[PDB]
Design a protein around this ligand. Structure first.
Ligand SMILES: C[N+]1(C)C[C@H](O)C[C@H]1C(=O)[O-]
Ligand SMILES: C[N+]1(C)C[C@H](O)C[C@H]1C(=O)[O-]
Ligand SMILES: C[N+]1(C)C[C@H](O)C[C@H]1C(=O)[O-]
Ligand SMILES: C[N+]1(C)C[C@H](O)C[C@H]1C(=O)[O-]
Ligand SMILES: C[N+]1(C)C[C@H](O)C[C@H]1C(=O)[O-]
Ligand SMILES: [Mg+2]
Ligand SMILES: [Mg+2]
Ligand SMILES: [Mg+2]
Ligand SMILES: [Mg+2]
Ligand SMILES: [Mg+2]
Ligand code: NI
Ligand code: NI
Lengths: 367, 368, 367, 367, 355
């Protein structure tokens, strides 16, 4: 089955209860980029990519659109299968995983609709009908973080990510301690996310002062080299997030045993094809990981949920979704949502979405 | 959610045409293959196969295949016929025994493709090519004769030659590789020197040191992972792992430490197509060439290897070796894959692309 | 003296007060595989191998029988001595140490009977007339683990292994702490056996939270690579168990100083010939080790007791026997047993057992 | 002096007598992206960035424009100095060095015009009035490469880069051998550029077969990890080019002594501010390097020539310019050009260019 | 069976003399076992005849009542004296002799079972003029030796290189294995040169330099195999060397490693790691040579680089009938009980020392 046409759209998503505060930069609203692939038989597949602001990673909305124009321009006539798609995409544009991801998601949607099976089947088969999620607390005053921590634990979340940084480390330590005192005993898993915001000096301190607090340190420092620096000097587990920019890079990290796990985003790694290989890699190495993306609506969230359902539950640290912060569903009936801290896995063909072909207005670009 | 309703096991002898096939770790005259038939609840069937290359090549043998498949089969009825649910269930029934698990994995991919009406290569992500390269394996033999066969095989169209060495003085192995190279230099054919675990580090160092002018890769020259690590910083020839690549975990250790420049990879050793496709993706990310082989087998094994090989970037695919030229019979005489002009046409039918008579292998040895 | 005939049998050993709980898979009852070697003069030697279920290690009862069939089929005519035996066995079948072990044990039994000396003499000579043992606590409720631990210390065991895993690490930590509370001050040695069940994340936490508890961490993680990962980050001693699958691998581990000691099983290493080499390696390196096997009756237990008797007591962490969990003795008079937490070493020829040749019924296979 | 306005333009540059063949992908024509910064007093500075096709690196013309739109939109009121500029740019957009480079170049042009001094003075002071260059031979038949090598050597180039790859390694070896047979005896420097195109297998072979040929191996393989893999196994010097994506990564490479030198592009490292730091790092480490960019007209070429003039000549491997492949000059009088294999350094204020404010037509974007 | 008495003797072994030290262990039933240790003079290793005797007096004085088995023996010996492996080796050999005699089986059976009835040997060429070495090399190849060790050093590296090239030219085509033994005599500077100039000559470099550290220095810079000899002073050190893959093989001496009990462990270690090794000792008569031959017979022949014996340089036998000897470059393995020797209890005269 061949790609006949590709259409590109953008749409705004304002942060409900915003802003969402991250040490690398806060977000109040997001411009998502939507891909529709149309097959020669008229069937469609949807894809999406939505950077969380322009400073979180090497990605932005205008960049997604520009890269997708290049990719779309060379894709008519290509087979709508993941390996042929990626081979063609790599021949048109180097890098830009986050743009490539949107086309990859759309191909998986189209493929599943063609064969009449859910994307999770195409990814090897779901191991579960519902997946755990985790809640991310933005950088905030310690007492409020403690208050929300308990609130989200009572709502059913199995894991809590505490965002830190962009302020003195004293306050970050105060925050993690207060959150811990609020939720200790509940068995909820704890991640301290520095979002590249800490010098090695302060990362060493954070771990050294808190041996009694069972957080994992998620991307505390700004580079792969700084993770290597602190690894032999921190007795807490270390997780890579922002630095995991390719399958190659994660292979370097986990075979050198630099980290004990990953925050992983579908768009950063280049789509479900590479996310599936990443999952298989982590399973082989017994390394827990999340199944996230940067931001987005129903399309992104469906993609993450489908991949998350194929991960051994003990290794799946949770699928984080932007859903609670997004005031819209592209598909009000079937769009995934967090319920009791968990997410029900879609069972329809493809991503499990029915979205009107003209939902996102006239195309910004067609090829 | 199509479930497995019944599993049947069989064994069948495959005598080596023009045998024996000579390896440093153990010669082979005839091989016992183990066949799995998975019957789904709608009566659709999937075939799988595993056939160790004698009992001394690797930690695997025909009797062991059957015994492990009995344990796996006994706990598999009612399982979903999808790769991840299958492997999760299999791992809950029996630790290790990748070569046995591989047969069930292949059968599940066959059944899955038939249910969906698509070839196994589609299920593995999509073929990049309609035909794949192969390589010829010259057994350990007299040097001038190795050279004569090497040229014959090059002229048949093989893109790559594997020269089997070992179980004799290193002097002779060096003589062989030089005679072979003299015969084919200038044809551009790729060259692998396979020590088949047979060299001490002493002799491996010598083999590389004496032949900088011969562009072989050294395939599994020594007996262990540690010995590969020993010679790696002291050999200026590329090094490939084969026998030591016993799990996804192990190959990840090897390639991210850059111990090797490539792999001979066998579907059964890695535990089936599910793991082989992850391995493929790992090699693609690392730009590491690899083969797509298995130990031995008939049409079922050979189809499995051809399907995965079709999904590899041709510049990284060192060839799919098949036992086909050494196997007198085809299970499916019409659709069974075969080597023609040193290459292999990729099957396009649903599943593995085979139709095998349900009673081809006689009554089941075991059913569960 | 040459081997004239080999006979194979299987026998079921139901777990007394079962099941025995392991993170890698629990056990309710076990099929043991018995080897009888008949020499050309009619003298017999017995051997045995019994995996602890099919998921603990790469070994199962059906695999033992299948491998022993191949080995037995090429063994008539071989000298009944350890090196000629292993040389012939390696020419017939690659690997399968647990099967090869049964034939090795039988050869040592036969050899000792021919020469009129105990197996411990053939292994270099016993250093003691009784050996220490250790008790293995299955995964259980922390308070009950603590109660059983004190009870076993009071029986006279010099060491306790606490099995952990297949549940949240919080509970494993609660268990080790409560066990320690119960037995501290008695000087009983403590092992915390993760049985390959912990991610590196959780292994780091287990050590980090408990510097005050003198456990060794026995095989906390699933691979050699994960042991390498946590080694520079845990201040507790690390022991290898399941990963010690050959003399080659042990040499890698202990000369890189990856571990401070070993759980070692006779079947995993391939028999008494390799176990005595292993013992000599540990003595040269001052590394303590156990002298165990997976499971089995009188034959396995005799083998473990004989090798254990030749180890310097300060390095011998104990010989664990399945005996207390096995209802029946093959030789009720001479079969070894744990008394006051210790085991009296047999002094008769060979393994020190006399088993009726028809004890296990007719042979399943003869060659 | 503050920035009052930023204008963005694009312009076509067809490869004179192309294509220019690279393993990572050939080029027939390039779209350049031009920046004009206007200060509050009306003085202007010009900048430029022109990726060499979309597959050479993680950069493309559409991406340059999209990123520059984001950057320009937040730069009004910023001080026209390198550190204030980069600090502001980094607060607006993560990464995208190739886009940031264009604004950096425009800032240096403006700054030099305000102070009445050449950019090379602002960079610390030129050490020479003319700089060496090197000629890059595209991938071509070995016989043709050898003849072109001979012609360029006789023309006066001090160094030749031979582009290789995207074909059997046998042909690359034939090519470097013939080039060597042509230029041995002339003293010209030789670089063999694999352009990320070789597996480690083939890179090992290329070096092993040619110890008598004094090439440096420039970026033979596809990743930093692959350079690390071959480094202890190749007796030829190794240079990094494509992998040198930030000052951070260069520091990792040269302090671990992974490489003996660099091909460095101004746009990849993020502009003249970072190129100057890179220059100082190479001087401290005694590591030779080029002063190139990916492609471009007079603006890019001026920037490269200015930085190149400040490098110790013995460490300056040459400033490669796209000029011979570019039909037009933005400033026909003052635009730099290669003559006798060398480049005369401009001496006017700023970059030393006068370009009509309307040369590129109406702005595509203004902020 | 307990040790009742231990007697020590010294004897001047005439050459074709060196002071050998003989141990007789007498069991309580009157059964005797013979052991021996004989350093090659005082400068080759940290060992000498006077030291052997002094250490053996200490060991003998605390051994009455000990069990005549290898592990009880070594446990008691280590409790009486630290190190002195070469002295301990003599008692270890005597214990194995006595044990085999008691059970009526050869030492090779007690060591796990012989894999062959005859073992390969190798010839050691002393440091000599290059043309002479080449002439003798061919001579010894034609006698049937499967391996040739060329001793080098104590002179300019230029001449060592000339010597190895001339030897190789003389014997290439015969398949004889070649070892270049630097005898700790080369600086790393010269060891690097020796390998670098000779990639075409298939020697292994046996102990080229003076320390373990120097072997570590040259290992990543030499494309020739490296063997350890003199530095292999304990099982512990061997484990360090071979698991770090510092070397590709060993020259190993029974006395240096502390006797047959430790040599057997070393053999098993090399078999696990696929590392070839010799089975030698420093010097000695029939007792030392029997011990080496028994352990050598239990090694996989492909891994056994040869048992070197002092026998052709020793002008007498303790047991002329059963003493091992090299014939056609190989050694027939003894088959009688113990070491396979019958030596008169009064052969060496009255004890120098008894305990
Ligand atoms: C919590 N996230 C998954 C959502 C944001 O995009 C930030 C990210 C993270 O873990 O850093
Ligand atoms: C050539 N093979 C694929 C066939 C045998 O199974 C041996 C194997 C190899 O590469 O060694
Ligand atoms: C305690 N054991 C010896 C008995 C089982 O076989 C498990 C084993 C262990 O230490 O893991
Ligand atoms: C020679 N260059 C500077 C021109 C192209 O942009 C490629 C580059 C290189 O060195 O690879
Ligand atoms: C050849 N040896 C065994 C005898 C001498 O004692 C020297 C020694 C060696 O290999 O160095
Ligand atoms: Mg994060
Ligand atoms: Mg192979
Ligand atoms: Mg254990
Ligand atoms: Mg370059
Ligand atoms: Mg020596
Ligand atoms: Ni510490
Ligand atoms: Ni070299």
């Amino acid at each position: 089955l061949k790609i006949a046409e590709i259409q590109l759209f953008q749409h705004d998503l304002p942060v409900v209860n915003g802003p969402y505060r991250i040490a690398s930069g806060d977000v109040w609203s997001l411009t998502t980029t939507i891909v529709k692939i149309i097959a020669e038989d008229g069937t469609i597949g949807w894809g999406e990519t939505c950077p969380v602001g322009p400073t979180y990673a090497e990605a932005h909305a205008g960049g997604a659109l520009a890269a997708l124009e290049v990719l779309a321009s060379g894709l008519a006539g290509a087979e709508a299968l993941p390996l042929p798609l990626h081979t063609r995409m790599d021949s048109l544009l180097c890098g830009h995983n986050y743009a490539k991801s949107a086309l990859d998601i759309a191909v998986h949607d189209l493929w599943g609709k063609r064969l009449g099976v859910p994307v999770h089947e195409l990814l090897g088969g779901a191991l579960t009908d519902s997946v755990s999620s985790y809640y991310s607390l933005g950088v905030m005053e310690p007492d409020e973080a403690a208050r929300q921590a308990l609130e989200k634990q009572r709502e059913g979340y199995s894991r809590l990510q505490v965002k830190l940084g962009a302020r003195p480390i004293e306050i970050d330590i105060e925050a993690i301690r207060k959150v811990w005192e609020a939720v200790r005993g509940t068995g909820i898993a704890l991640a301290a996310d520095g979002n590249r915001g800490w010098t090695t000096r302060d990362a060493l301190r954070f771990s050294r002062e808190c041996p009694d607090i069972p957080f994992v340190m998620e991307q505390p420092c700004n580079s792969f080299e700084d993770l290597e620096a602190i690894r032999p000097l921190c007795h807490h587990a270390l997780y890579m997030d922002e630095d995991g920019t390719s399958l190659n890079t994660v292979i370097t990290a986990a075979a050198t045993s630099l980290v004990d796990g990953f925050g992983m985003k579908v768009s950063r790694i280049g789509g479900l094809q590479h996310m599936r290989a990443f999952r298989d890699f982590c399973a082989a190495r017994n390394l827990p990981h999340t199944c996230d993306d940067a931001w987005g609506g129903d399309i992104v969230s469906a993609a993450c949920t489908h991949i998350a359902s194929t991960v051994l539950p003990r290794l799946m640290e949770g699928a984080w979704l932007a859903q609670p912060y997004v005031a819209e569903h592209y598909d009000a009936e079937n769009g995934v949502r967090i319920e009791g801290g968990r997410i029900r896995v879609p069972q329809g063909p493809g991503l499990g979405l029915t979205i009107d072909p003209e939902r996102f207005g006239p195309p910004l670009f067609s090829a």
